[PDB]
Structure 1
Amino acid sequence: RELAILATAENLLEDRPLADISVDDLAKGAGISRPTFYFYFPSKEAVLLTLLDRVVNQADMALQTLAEDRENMWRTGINVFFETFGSHKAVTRAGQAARATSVEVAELWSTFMQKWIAYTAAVIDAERDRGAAPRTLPAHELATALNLMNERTLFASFAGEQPSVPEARVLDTLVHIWVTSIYGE
């Protein structure tokens, strides 16, 4: 029943914004009543938070799995986000828009971005320690800009935004900019 509500909200988010979806909608698709819905979630907003929270953790776990040539290493890491978020475009789109109106969605996003940037910087620092990358910008600042570039450019591509890099070109585009800015210088 919790799973059914989640699947239903993801299904419907493919067709319309969260605002055009009602508790009654989610309830119907899940095969339960409205008050029964309120036993699982306080609100439709809470349902989107849980969907985003699962997609973000799935990216984060895949990146932990990788952690356990240099161009390919970065490509494989960026690809976690391309495939994870790009396989859940409706949740990605609605979760990003909700950052504006939900402090819990904003804090969720912020917490994981900090984590991913800290880990990016730790890897740059290792590449510098081994003599493979030059000591140019402070690692954490470089990492932060690269992570934000990916956030905006991935998500603009997935949304078909104008402008955006075509989805079929965006992985290669981001990998080039990461490798050149990390190893260049």
Structure 2
Amino acid sequence: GDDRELAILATAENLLEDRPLADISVDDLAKGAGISRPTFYFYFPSKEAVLLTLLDRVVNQADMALQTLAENPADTDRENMWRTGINVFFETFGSHKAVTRAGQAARATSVEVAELWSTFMQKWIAYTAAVIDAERDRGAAPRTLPAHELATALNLMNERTLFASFAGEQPSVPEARVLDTLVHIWVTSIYGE
């Protein structure tokens, strides 16, 4: 029961490694999960709902990890504290590249996918802007741009740059260099006069 659901999600994630959602049928997902077509419909209304569930699981994983770090500050310097947050994405989405690719292709057409990602980005941009505000109040950062506008651009940069790196787009920063590249831009733009 919870078994068949997990097998349907595992099948979709496996299949999305080789082709887009448009080339996967409900019959392919059911066949991979060892169930019939109408049994599939008991668990999901459509192959699009399977993708949404996979995206919801990955986004909550990242969010829970970031909550853990926000509750458990590392005894390290400021550059390494920003690095630890960025690395959540690097590690969580970078462990589910096919799902990430499929979430981005769906965003153009799917209101549900676009809304799910927006809700989460609003949260992480708010947390970012709150940290920057805290750092300015402590005298560690200068009051330059509005913190919430700076946080919005830096989080958008990381969304698009990690995507390109994970995809091997041309142009992209190589995946083994992208964390240091992003952390440089965050620390200079937040602490730089």
Distance 1:58 1:159 in 2: 21
Q: Which deviations, in whole Å up to 9, do the C-alpha atoms of 1:100-124 show, x marking residues without a partner?
A: 1111001001111111101111111
Distance 1:17 1:110 in 2: 23
Matched, 1:83 2:88: no
Q: Which deviations, in whole Å up to 9, do the C-alpha atoms of 1:82-108 show, x marking residues without a partner?
A: 101101100001001111111100100
1:54 offset after TM fit, Å?
Answer: 0.4
- For 1:104, the equivalent position in structure 2 comes to 112
* Pick aligned residue for 2:141 from 133, 138, 142: 133
Distance 2:136 2:61 in 1: 29
- For 2:190, the equivalent position in structure 1 comes to 182
1:129 offset after TM fit, Å?
Answer: 1.1
Distance 1:97 1:114 in 2: 21
1:28 offset after TM fit, Å?
Answer: 0.5
1:169 offset after TM fit, Å?
Answer: 0.5
| Structure 1 unaligned residues grouped into runs of 5+ | none
- For 2:153, the equivalent position in structure 1 comes to 145
Distance 1:150 1:117 in 2: 11
Q: Which deviations, in whole Å up to 9, do the C-alpha atoms of 1:35-81 show, x marking residues without a partner?
A: 00000001000000000000001000000000000000000010001
SS at match of 2:182: helix
Distance 1:67 1:25 in 2: 41
* Pick aligned residue for 1:5 from 8, 16, 20: 8
SS at match of 2:173: coil
- For 1:92, the equivalent position in structure 2 comes to 100
Q: Which deviations, in whole Å up to 9, do the C-alpha atoms of 1:113-140 show, x marking residues without a partner?
A: 1111011111111111111111100000
Distance 1:174 1:107 in 2: 25
- For 1:165, the equivalent position in structure 2 comes to 173
TM-score w.r.t. the length of structure 2 is 0.95
Distance 1:137 1:36 in 2: 54
1:161 offset after TM fit, Å?
Answer: 0.4
* Superposed CA RMSD: 0.5
Distance 2:39 2:109 in 1: 26
Distance 2:182 2:67 in 1: 20
Q: Which structure 1 residue ranges, 4+ long, deviate > 6 Å from structure 2?
A: none
Distance 2:82 2:44 in 1: 38
Question: What percent of counterpart residues are identical?
Answer: 100
* Pick aligned residue for 1:121 from 114, 117, 129: 129
Distance 2:137 2:33 in 1: 53
